[PDB]
Structures are given as C-alpha cells and as structure tokens.
Nucleic acid binder design. Structure first.
Ligand SMILES: [Mg+2]
Ligand SMILES: [Mg+2]
Ligand SMILES: [Mg+2]
Ligand SMILES: [Mg+2]
Ligand SMILES: [Mg+2]
Ligand SMILES: [Mg+2]
Ligand SMILES: [Mg+2]
Ligand SMILES: [Mg+2]
Ligand SMILES: [Mg+2]
Ligand SMILES: [Mg+2]
Ligand SMILES: [Mg+2]
Ligand SMILES: [Mg+2]
Ligand SMILES: [Mg+2]
Ligand SMILES: [Mg+2]
Ligand SMILES: [Mg+2]
Ligand SMILES: [Mg+2]
Ligand SMILES: [Mg+2]
Ligand SMILES: [Mg+2]
Ligand SMILES: [Mg+2]
Ligand SMILES: [Mg+2]
Ligand SMILES: [Mg+2]
Ligand SMILES: [Mg+2]
Ligand SMILES: [Mg+2]
Ligand SMILES: [Mg+2]
Ligand SMILES: [Mg+2]
Ligand SMILES: [Mg+2]
Lengths: 113, 138, 328, 101, 132
RNA sequence: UAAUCGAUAAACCCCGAUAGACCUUACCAACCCUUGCCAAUUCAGCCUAUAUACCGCCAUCUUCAGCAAACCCUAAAAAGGAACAAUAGUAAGCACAAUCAUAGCACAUAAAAACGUUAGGUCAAGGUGUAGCUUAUGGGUUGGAAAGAAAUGGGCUACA
C-alpha cells in the first residue's frame, strides 16, 4: 500500500507569512517551498534539474528563514533587550579623554563539539 | 484567523551595575564561497540598521592555500595533482555599542550563522582607569 | 510538451507571487531584476559557473525553443518546403532569390526607360555593419544549419547588396546586419583639477609586473620628479630606469614643464620604473590635446604590460624547462 | 581490530608516551641545564635510561588514520595522500578543490 | 587517464546521477561539496576530528539504510549541532522509517556528544541527470 | 654480507620516499607467546604466491579526434557510405569545441582529453577471487642491516 501525498505547494496561501513556514534553519525541504527553483548545469537539449530530488539545492545553505520580513519581525522584538548608546561619546576625541584605556579581547566560534 | 493571544512573556530586568561600553567591534567572517558571504553581509546590515548601529563593511583580501600530491599510487612523480583551498573574508565594523546591545546583536548573529563559515569576534572594551592609578603617590 | 510548458507558466507565476510576498516587495512592480537578486540572496550558491547557480525564469527562457507543429491533423504539412529537410532556411533562400529576380527585372525596366534613381548603400563602414555568424543564423532559424549553406546564404546576400537596392530590399537586408559598435577605443580623458589653490593638477595610476604606481603631476611647476619622498636620481641609480622616466616626458616635450611626485610599491628596480612610466603617460593626457594622446597610445605609452611571471608547472623547472629526458 | 599491527603498536607507544610525559619532562630539566653540577646530571642520565623504551615520544610515528600508511600522510587531516584524494574527488571534504591558476 | 571519482561510459544505457555525472575537476565550478564545516578554513583547526566523523557517518548511514539510499549524504555542521540530509527511496514503510530516524537521532547524539538532526527526502526512484 | 621489496625502452634511475640511529621496516640473528586487538565465532592473524583475475589509482599514443546507441542504402552486405555548381546518408550520447580558474576584457597558462593499445606499473595506500600457513609463512623484546674492485643516470660547486 503505497501512498503519494501532494506537497504544501497546492495549499500555500498567496499572502501566507513566510517566517511561519521557515522560522529556523532548515535543510530546504522541497515540499514546503512553493517556489519552482531549478539548480544545476543544463543539458544540450535538457533543462536544469527541478527542486525535486536535487542534491545541489540541499548542499547550499538556505536563507529562507532570514528573509527581510522575518529579519524585521525578529529585530523588532529585540529592541527590549538592547540599551541606548550615550550621545556624549559620539566623537572619539571625548572618548579618549573619558575612557583612555582600550581593552581588546578575542572571541571565536567554530562548528563542532 | 486563529491567532494565539498573550504570546509575549519575557524576563527582562535592569541591574544597577553600569553597562559595559565598547569602542569597536570587529567581526571577521571567513568562508569558502562568496555568495554565502554576500548574503550574510546583507543580512547583518539589515539587522544592524534596524537597531541603529551604523555598521561599516569592507572585504579583506582572500587567502589561497595550494598543495601538491602524487597523481598515481606507486611510482609516478612527474605527474602531480594540485589542490586549492580558498578562504574569503568579510569585515563587519561596528562602533558605539554597549554591553547589552553588543550581546543581543551577537546573539542574533550567531544564532543564524551558516554552517560553512566561521566568525572571529574582537571587542574593544572601554574603561576609564583602575582604582590604583587615578591619583596615587606610591 | 505544450501542456507541460503551459503548467510551468502557471507555476512560475505563482512562485513569483510567493517570492514577492516573502521578500516584501510589490508583486506588480516585481521584475526579473528583482527575481535575480532574490534568488541570489535566498540560495547563495557559490560556484564559478554562472549557469550552475539556481535560476528561475520564464519557461520560454529556461526551456529551449521548440519547432512548430509541421503538419495538421490531416497529415498535410503546412509549409511547401517541408520535404526539403530545412524548410526555414530553404524558404529564406527562395525568398531572397525571388527578391533578387524582382530587383533585376525592376532595374532592367529602369535601364530600358533610362531612369537611374537608386544609390549605392552597400558601403556601411562608418556604421560598423557585419553579416550574421552561423550561431546568429541558427538562433533565428530553429533548425540546424551547415557551413556551406551559411556561406551560400552570405554570398547570395552580397549579390543582392551589389545591385541597386529597393525600398523594402534594403530593410530586408538590414535585419541580417549586426551593427558592432566596438571601434571607439578612445580612452577617457581626466579633466584638469584644481585642489587647494593649485592649478594644472592631475593624477595617474599605473601597474606593471606586481608594481603599483601613482603619480601626481602639476603643470605649473618646474621639471623634477620626487619618488617616495626622495629624488628620482637617488631612487633610480640605473641609467635605463631614468630613461624610462624620460620616455613619456620627452615624447610630449614636457621635460622641464611639469613637477611630478610618484609613489610606487612592489616589484623590482625595472618594474617600478615601468609602472611609473605607465602612470605618468596616463596622467599626461590631461595636459595635452587629443591628437597627441593617440600618438602616445600608438607609441605604447598608454597601454599596460600583460607580461607577468608564469606559474611553475609540476615536473618542470621554470614552467618551460623540462627535466633531462633520457631516451633509454 | 585496528588497521595493522604496526598501528596497534603505535597506539601503545603513544599511550606510554602520554603516561611517561611528566616523568620525562621533569627528568630532562636536570639534563638540559648548566647551573646544576654534572655529577647529578650523570645519575639523571641513568634514571632516564632506565625508563621503558616505548615511553619516549621519538618512537611515535605519524601514520594514516584510515590505512595506517607510514608515509605520504598530511598532518592537518591525518590521512594518506591517496585516501585524501579519494575523499576530496568525491567531495566529502569542504573547501577542497582542484587547483586551477 | 584520470579515473578518480569518474564513472566510465557504458554503451549508452547506464543511469547516472548529477553528482556522478561530473568529474572531480568540476568541484566548486558546477557541483558543490557534500559536506560543510569550519575545519577546512584558513585559521581554523580540528579538521581530522571532523573528517573521521564524516567518514563514520557515511559508512554508518550506508549500512543503516541498505538499498534505499539514492545519493550521498549532505553533512552540515552548524554550531555544535550536525544536520544529516539524505535522499531515500520510498521502499520502507513510514513506520520503519520513523523507527530508524528516531534510533539514529539518539544513537549518533550519544556517540558523538553533540546534537544530531536527521532529515530524509523520499524520492520515487533515483533521479537520472544524463543518459539512461 | 645473516640481511627487504617493487620500478628497472620511450612511459625506470633525488622513482614508491613531501624522506631509514630504536619506531618507521614488510630484512636477518638471538631469544618468548600460541582462540593470541574485537562482544562472539573448529576463530583471529599472514607485507605468502598470482598486477597474466581485480577494484580503486596512474603512464603512453594525447591538445590525435575519434568512439558510439537508434536508423537507412548497396543487383549482398567480409564490409563501406563522401563529392557544396553535392553522387546516401540522418544521428541521441561520449570526446573535441564552448564554458570555468589565474577576481576587468583579449591573449596565454592552468585544467580537461572519449573508446581503446602496451596481458604497461601498483596483491607492499586500502579491500580483495583462487591457491597456500595455524605451537607458524602468525604475534612480542634486543642487536645489526656493512663496504666499494668497478660501470652509469640526475642535480650542486666551480674550472675564473
Ligand atoms: Mg631554471
Ligand atoms: Mg589485513
Ligand atoms: Mg618516528
Ligand atoms: Mg631492490
Ligand atoms: Mg621483481
Ligand atoms: Mg627521478
Ligand atoms: Mg630494524
Ligand atoms: Mg606475517
Ligand atoms: Mg595487468
Ligand atoms: Mg611484476
Ligand atoms: Mg567528433
Ligand atoms: Mg559487391
Ligand atoms: Mg556503418
Ligand atoms: Mg552521434
Ligand atoms: Mg577566466
Ligand atoms: Mg585558453
Ligand atoms: Mg596536464
Ligand atoms: Mg577542453
Ligand atoms: Mg604482465
Ligand atoms: Mg614497461
Ligand atoms: Mg592481502
Ligand atoms: Mg608479493
Ligand atoms: Mg624488532
Ligand atoms: Mg653510483
Ligand atoms: Mg654543473
Ligand atoms: Mg664557495
């Protein structure tokens, strides 16, 4: 008993919010993306391969969760955590007079355990 | 139509300890391909302009590491195979930040960092003077 | 495959609408220029071949052009040259020959009536007109073409052009004319600048053999060169290096009429001199007329030097010197 | 099992070198100095000679992780020049590509 | 003749995927790398530590999904958590697919002391790019 | 000499080795252990033979362009298939070409170079079909693996 379910493309709304579909980093599942994207080197008579079963699309990182609308929506909620920079230190001439000491610290991030 | 109600409940408190000031935050993003770096640069600029940071972005020169190996298995030294490793750099220069603003920007940057790139963070912490140097005489 | 393309059109439209919705721009004002940027941002595929990057265009742009249905439902072909193999090319040749015959008859009648009102329009040298290449003909005629057939078509077009052209004949020929505009290799002349009460001021840049030089030239000062804060004689003890500096000024007779400061980094003794020479030649264009700029660019002053060191190859000594090959 | 008996013995050599890393580091201080008299340095020579042979890091050989090849192994990936090519050509290693310039 | 990562041409009936249809000299030109991490950068370290894990993951997934694996794995390494993207033929029932994915997402995490995500894309058959 | 091996016409000779005081080392002499790396297996383990069984990888023609599925034709067909003012040739595809990289073009370089030939090199990168070891052709420790009568290949130093 084999079952073949149609993807989300036929059910995607025209004005549906995209961050709701792609909130975090995803492996770019073709069933959740209604955009027909062809990636790959074309053939002499053929065309670049579609999004179904295309390994090249899964290889590349996808920024579908970082669309400008989602960036604006996320950054709007982050205004509550940030603090205001004092306007009295706009120019470095007064910064040198007030806090002459500079402390350089190095921080690194790397993928792995 | 079915939108949940009362979806926001954060835990934010303000302490009496003065916030840390930073003069310059340098972000060196190293990667293999330039398209990912350009997309990340656009994402970082869009995120920083919303918070009002006035980020300066410039591209440091690339670095290419090439090495040579034997082409055959047992004995063929006249024929070689050369492999190349490219490293492209992006420099994000942030100025006039506070301890909390830098923390939240770094959170929003690292939480969405791609898998094929790495990032080096250099913070220029601002400090006036320690206690034993203000006006002592031995 | 007509229905496949028809469905692909609808899928492309709905995908464009969804892309506009997710990007935040107006779908009505959404164009292919925005589509390219949206694809590049959403799918940042870093590859050296641009055709390997993800692309979303119209089906008529992505899928190749398709030959039209050559016959009806009754089996009868539409065009009368279907059984000739290349119906489009042979119809084009037949139309060209029919127009040639019509032009010949019209010109014969005009000559019999002693009427010569046509002119010679074949000479299109100032316009820069060329004939279609085989690829440019095969992109027009969907079916494949042959070199001999293309040569025959070109030689029939020249025969048609060699005769007094009519009103419509010249227009028909013009669609096979490609107006290549790559002839004005004239360089851009930097306008004379005035900075901080200084007159006759110009700047030039040069690069030769990993040596980058920038020259600042004043046309109101005396003839002298200051290189990296020291005199040019001290910086270039070799006679040849100073002859390289003299080469641009001597050609324009501007030896003692310009004061120049040069900053050159990288390269060796001769590479720096060559880069300074190129930068000075490029900077001297502003102080001279146009007829002398062409004289310098025909003398080699305004052309860069692509002669760079070649990379060493494996199994060799100096990228050309091979190892001692023993025959036995 | 391991790839080869040579690799199995090299694992034991590395374990013994790590076990005796502190003792040899402390002993070599008495031998590499000139302030202390040579009379104790001579005895320290016997003390370090009495140590087991496989305790010194010199016996450690850098082989391949996959095929335990004694030579032709890059230090960065700890893999032989042949397994490294077999993986790079398949594309399982990021940033590695044929050099074209 | 070069033979590394190169599938030879048969009489004209062999189905070949896009990854196999391109020679290794087309890497980063027409096809991308099968794995992404930071150990292969310039000023980074721990390259062999990730390489041995990548090889173990390739072999372990090849043995875990026998005969239903279409193409090679895509191993993303993003902030201490590793994602494994696989293309699987729809040969096994979903009940058996979920059992395997749940077993793997725990066994790999406990074995490598790092969070693991496993994503599967079910294909009706192997996708053919060149002649078949 | 008790003391490896392979390569050894173009395509071997600063070649495996981008690398030998113990290790590397598969060689030898002295000595020890034989379900002896693994959870287990009348099992492990063998650098034992066969590259004239292999795969994986390369050399050569080779910067030569041909190979080849589906077809068609020949007063039969082993086989061949061309006349551009064209006389039976269409041809998916693999090659070539194009494209890509040496961060602007052009050039150049790099890269690529199909089907096959040399029963070409590699059981010693690694796994291996067949034939052979199991108190040994297996597994551990120590010490030695010289030396040049002579011939030769490639490089450095010079003979000013
Ligand atoms: Mg030389
Ligand atoms: Mg074995
Ligand atoms: Mg060693
Ligand atoms: Mg020998
Ligand atoms: Mg022999
Ligand atoms: Mg040699
Ligand atoms: Mg020995
Ligand atoms: Mg043995
Ligand atoms: Mg053979
Ligand atoms: Mg042999
Ligand atoms: Mg051909
Ligand atoms: Mg006959
Ligand atoms: Mg034939
Ligand atoms: Mg063909
Ligand atoms: Mg190029
Ligand atoms: Mg070229
Ligand atoms: Mg070559
Ligand atoms: Mg080519
Ligand atoms: Mg033989
Ligand atoms: Mg031979
Ligand atoms: Mg064997
Ligand atoms: Mg043997
Ligand atoms: Mg021994
Ligand atoms: Mg000799
Ligand atoms: Mg000499
Ligand atoms: Mg000397």
């Amino acid at each position: 008993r084999r079952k073949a379910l149609p993807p989300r493309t036929e059910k995607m709304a025209v004005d549906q919010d995209w961050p709701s579909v792609y909130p975090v980093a995803a492996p770019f599942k073709p069933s959740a993306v209604p955009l027909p994207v062809r990636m790959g080197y074309p053939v002499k008579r053929g065309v670049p391969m579609a999004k179904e079963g295309n390994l090249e699309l899964l290889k590349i990182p996808n920024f579908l969760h970082l669309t400008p609308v989602a960036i604006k929506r996320h950054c709007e909620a982050l205004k509550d955590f940030c603090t205001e920079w004092p306007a009295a230190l706009d120019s470095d001439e007064k910064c040198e007079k007030h806090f002459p000491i500079e402390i350089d610290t190095a921080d690194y991030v790397s993928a792995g355990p | 139509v079915d939108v949940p109600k009362d979806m926001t409940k954060p835990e934010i408190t303000i302490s009496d300890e003065p916030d840390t000031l930073y003069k310059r935050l340098s972000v060196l993003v190293k990667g293999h391909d330039k398209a990912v770096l350009d997309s990340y640069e656009y994402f970082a600029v869009l995120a920083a302009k919303e918070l009002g940071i006035s980020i300066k972005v410039h591209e440091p020169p690339r670095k290419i590491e090439r090495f040579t190996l034997l082409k055959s298995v047992h004995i063929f030294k006249k024929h070689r195979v050369q492999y190349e490793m490219r490293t492209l750099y992006r420099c994000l220069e942030l100025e006039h930040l506070t301890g909390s603003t830098a923390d939240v920007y770094l959170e929003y940057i690292q939480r969405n960092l791609p898998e094929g790139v790495a990032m080096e963070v250099t913070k220029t912490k601002l400090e006036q003077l320690p206690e034993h140097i203000r006006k002592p005489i031995w | 495959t007509v229905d496949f393309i028809k469905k692909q059109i609808e899928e492309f439209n709905i995908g464009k609408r969804h892309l506009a919705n997710m990007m935040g721009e107006d779908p009505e004002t959404f164009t292919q220029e925005d589509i390219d940027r949206a694809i590049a941002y959403l799918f940042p595929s870093g590859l050296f071949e641009k055709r390997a990057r993800p692309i979303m265009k119209h089906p008529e742009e992505i899928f190749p052009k398709q030959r039209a249905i050559q016959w009806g439902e009754d089996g009868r072909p539409f065009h009368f040259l279907f059984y000739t193999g290349k119906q489009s090319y042979y119809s084009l040749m037949h139309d060209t020959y029919g127009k040639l015959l019509d032009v010949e008859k019209h010109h014969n009648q005009l000559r019999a009536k002693d009427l010569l009102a046509e002119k010679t329009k074949i000479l299109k040298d100032p316009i820069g007109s060329r004939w279609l290449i085989k690829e440019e003909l095969e992109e027009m005629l969907v079916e494949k073409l042959s070199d001999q057939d293309y040569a025959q078509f070109i030689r029939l077009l020249e025969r048609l052009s060699a005769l007094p052209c009519g009103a419509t004949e010249e227009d028909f020929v013009n669609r096979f004319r490609r107006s290549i505009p790559i002839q004005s290799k004239k360089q851009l002349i930097e306008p004379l600048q005035y900075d901080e009460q200084g007159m006759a001021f110009s700047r030039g840049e040069g690069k030769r053999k990993t040596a980058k030089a920038e020259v600042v030239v004043y046309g109101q000062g005396s003839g002298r060169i200051d290189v990296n804060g020291v005199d040019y004689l001290l910086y270039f003890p070799v006679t040849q290096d100073r002859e390289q500096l003299m080469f641009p000024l001597h050609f324009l007779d501007r030896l003692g009429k310009h004061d120049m400061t040069c900053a050159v980094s990288g390269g060796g003794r001769s590479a720096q001199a060559g880069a300074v020479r190129l930068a000075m030649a490029r900077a001297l264009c502003s102080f001279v007329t146009e007829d002398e700029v062409e004289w310098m660019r025909q003398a080699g002053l305004l052309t860069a030097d692509p002669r760079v060191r070649e990379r060493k190859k494996p199994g060799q000594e100096g990228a050309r010197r091979k190892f001692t090959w023993k025959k036995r | 099992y391991y790839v080869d008996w040579k690799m199995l013995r090299d694992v034991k050599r590395r374990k013994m070198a790590y076990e005796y890393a502190d003792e040899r580091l402390r002993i070599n201080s008495l031998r590499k100095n000139t302030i202390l008299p040579k009379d104790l340095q001579e005895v320290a020579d016997e003390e370090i000679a009495s140590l087991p042979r496989d305790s010194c890091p010199v016996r450690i050989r850098n082989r391949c992780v996959m095929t335990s090849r004694p030579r032709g192994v890059k230090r960065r990936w700890r893999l032989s020049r042949i397994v490294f090519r077999h993986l790079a050509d398949h594309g399982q290693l990021s940033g590695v590509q044929r050099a074209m310039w | 003749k070069n033979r590394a990562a190169r599938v030879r041409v048969s009489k004209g009936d062999k189905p070949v995927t896009y990854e196999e249809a391109h020679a290794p000299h087309y890497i980063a030109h027409r096809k991308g790398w099968l794995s992404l991490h930071t150990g292969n950068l310039d000023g980074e370290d721990h390259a062999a530590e990730r390489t041995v894990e990548d090889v173990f993951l390739r072999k372990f997934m090849l043995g875990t999904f026998p005969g239903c694996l279409a193409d090679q794995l895509v191993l993303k390494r993003r902030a201490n958590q590793l994602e494994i993207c696989a293309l699987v033929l729809r040969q096994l029932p979903p009940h058996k697919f979920y059992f395997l994915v749940g077993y793997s997402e725990t066994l790999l995490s406990h074995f490598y002391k790092c969070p693991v995500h496993l994503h599967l894309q079910t294909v009706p058959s192997k996708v053919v790019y060149k002649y078949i």
